[PDB]
Structures are given as structure tokens and as C-alpha cells.
Amino acid sequence: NSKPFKIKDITRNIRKAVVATTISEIRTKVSLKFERAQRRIHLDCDGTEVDDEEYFSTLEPNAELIAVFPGEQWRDP
């Protein structure tokens, strides 16, 4: 294995952290942390979507993520 991760909402005002070993785990825990359903994980810096375990395994510890929920889109600045 597990690693720490930072996840924010798209406006970057809700700033939270999760410990996870798989993308399935991070998604469940991010829903519990944000109290919102069907989290989609994107990179904070560039909006890249993380939707397979292979790319999730390449992520560094304490990588900065954005949680984009249904009806939302990742925002740039």
C-alpha cells in the first residue's frame, strides 16, 4: 504493498488523503471520504484519468489526485 495518496475535489477546496493498495480500494475509500458516489480518479496536475490497475501501480507515494464525480470534469489551474 500500500501507499498514501492525496485526493481533492475538482475545485480543490476539499483536500483529503487515503491509503490504498489497488485502484478499487482507492475508489471505495474516496467515496467514503467525499460522501459522493462513483468516484473517477484523475491526476491533479494534468487531468489524466487513472482507470486501470497497471497505471495505478506506476503512481508514486503521496501522488496528488483529483476525484471527479458523475457530471463533473477535471479543471485546469
Residue numbers in the entry: 117 to 193
From the paper:
The cell-death-inducing DFF45-like effector (CIDE) domain is a protein-interaction module comprising ∼80 amino acids and was initially identified in several apoptotic nucleases and their regulators. DREP3 is a CIDE-domain-containing protein in Drosophila and has been suggested to be a regulator of nucleases. Unlike proteins harbouring the CIDE domain at the N-terminus, the DREP3 CIDE domain is located in the middle of the protein.
To further understand this dynamic protein-interaction module, we obtained a crystal of the DREP3 CIDE domain which had a calculated Matthews coefficient (V M) of 2.76 Å3 Da−1, corresponding to a solvent content of 55.43%, and solved the structure at a resolution of 3.0 Å. The final model contained residues 117–193 for all nine molecules.
